[PDB]
Paper text:
Here, inspired by natural and re-engineered protein–peptide systems, we set out to design proteins made out of repeating units that bind peptides with repeating sequences, with a one-to-one correspondence between the repeat units of the protein and those of the peptide. We use geometric hashing to identify protein backbones and peptide-docking arrangements that are compatible with bidentate hydrogen bonds between the side chains of the protein and the peptide backbone. We design repeat proteins to bind to six different tripeptide-repeat sequences in polyproline II conformations. The proteins are hyperstable and bind to four to six tandem repeats of their tripeptide targets with nanomolar to picomolar affinities in vitro and in living cells.
Reasoning that proline-containing peptides would incur a lower entropic cost upon binding than non-proline-containing peptides, we decided to start our experimental characterization with designs containing at least one proline residue; in most of these designs, the peptide backbone is in or near the polyproline II portion of the Ramachandran map. For the polyproline helix, there are roughly three residues per turn, and, probably because of this, we obtained more designs that target three-residue than two-residue proline-containing repeat units. Crystal structures reveal repeating interactions between protein and peptide interactions as designed, including ladders of hydrogen bonds from protein side chains to peptide backbones. Our results show that by matching superhelical parameters between repeating-protein and repeating-peptide conformations, and incorporating specific hydrogen-bonding and hydrophobic interactions between matched protein and peptide repeats, we can now design modular proteins that bind to extended peptides with high affinity and specificity.
Numbering used by the authors:
A (entry chain A): 3 to 280
B (entry chain B): 3 to 21
C (entry chain D): 203 to 216
The structure:
Amino acid sequence: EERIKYVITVVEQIAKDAHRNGQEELAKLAERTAEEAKKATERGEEETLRIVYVIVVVLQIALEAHRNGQEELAKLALRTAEEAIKATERGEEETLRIVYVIVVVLQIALEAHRNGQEELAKLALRTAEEAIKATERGEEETLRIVYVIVVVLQIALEAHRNGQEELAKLALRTAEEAIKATERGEEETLRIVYVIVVVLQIALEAHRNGQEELAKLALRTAEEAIKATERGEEETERIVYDIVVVLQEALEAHRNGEEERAKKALDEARRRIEATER
Amino acid sequence: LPPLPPLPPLPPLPPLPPL
Amino acid sequence: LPPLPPLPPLPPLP
């Protein structure tokens, strides 16, 4: 009720500002978004209104990307908005989820540019471009891999801000092997990529939760897994998985306040890592 | 009276489920 | 893959 009024007010402010700034393509997209938002308000279509909020965010990205000289990011934000508007009348139920992921990775690109992580910012644009290409053309399976890429890109951004530079470098490398494999089509490689991302999630969370020893073991697991991703073995996925299962137990035992079991899982995880390195 | 502040950025994606 | 999070409510005006 009052919230959709807020969203319509915001997008109308964007169009006025875009007109004043000479951003005619952005301004007209905002106007059509405002027109679409009012139609969905009279029809009570909640799902269309949810897409409206996401579209307004990516239009904010486009206006801000232009103000920062990030013209390529601005063009991708506009393409995202155009594709999102067309799909509202098309009737794709997955439109909200697809556009949501694209907007999140576009946010990473803009934020990484402000934080000096140009390498990460460049990678986020490529992920968005492939996601936009997949949606504009009709590629379905790619979007599943896009989700995992955006997750590991989030890890790299947070690790850099948290001072975990070793984790940030690994996350940057992991996404590239995913982006390279996405455009190459190697599906067996992507399975190992998924497990590595879980490993990187553990390392990020363990560092924040006073589990530095656990985090270091997770880094060893991921760094050993990348050397085998470039080796090309399916037994690697099983080997990493057996490490992941017990790395998770130590993390979950700490959350539940069971330090005795946390040490037991930690030592078994270390033993499994040592055998692979041996 | 002044323009409303912009919409906050979308929250990040939830982490991958555990194996 | 986990379901996408619902959008949090807007912060109040300053």
